[PDB]
């Protein structure tokens, strides 16, 4: 069982840097079903074994596309986290999907 100090020592080295959106579940294969170009994202230093985004990220989605999941990539093009969006969202025309915040837990 890890202590809080070990958890913080751990999370500091994850260093996620970008986010991509998919329409199919990327858990089995994150290289496929990309829908949007990579965008930058920033995180704060760990505390209580938790890291949170420092600001909102505006992602532009092409027309007639759908987004249902996301993924985070390192500074060296490796997928480290995956998850599902609150809703499957269909864009009739080009628009902005707003990422309010995202965090990674070890608790």
């Amino acid at each position: 069982t890890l202590t809080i100090d070990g958890k913080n020592k751990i999370l500091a080295t994850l260093t996620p840097t970008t986010i991509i959106l998919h329409n199919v579940d990327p858990t089995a294969d994150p290289t496929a079903n990309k829908v949007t170009q990579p965008v930058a994202i920033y995180f704060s230093e760990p505390d209580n074994g938790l890291i949170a985004s420092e600001d909102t990220v505006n992602i532009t989605v092409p027309a007639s596309a759908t987004v249902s999941h996301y993924s985070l990539w390192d500074a060296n093009d490796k997928c480290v986290a995956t998850g599902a969006l609150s809703k499957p969202q269909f864009f009739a025309e080009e628009g902005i999907y707003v990422i309010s915040s995202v965090s990674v837990d070890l608790n």
Partner: protein, 45 residues
């Protein structure tokens, strides 16, 4: 004769540890965003 001896008591164990993980993400389809300046506009050509 009958003799006895003593040795050191030895015990073995298997201690191991595990952590687990979680992830989160929240967003919505944006509209208008937020701007400090917000006024009626006229746009000529």
């Amino acid at each position: 004769r009958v003799h006895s001896y003593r040795g050191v008591l030895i015990i073995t164990d298997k201690l191991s540890v595990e952590a687990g993980s979680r992830a989160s993400l929240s967003g919505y389809i944006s509209d208008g965003g937020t701007s400090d300046v917000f006024t009626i506009c006229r746009l000529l050509d």
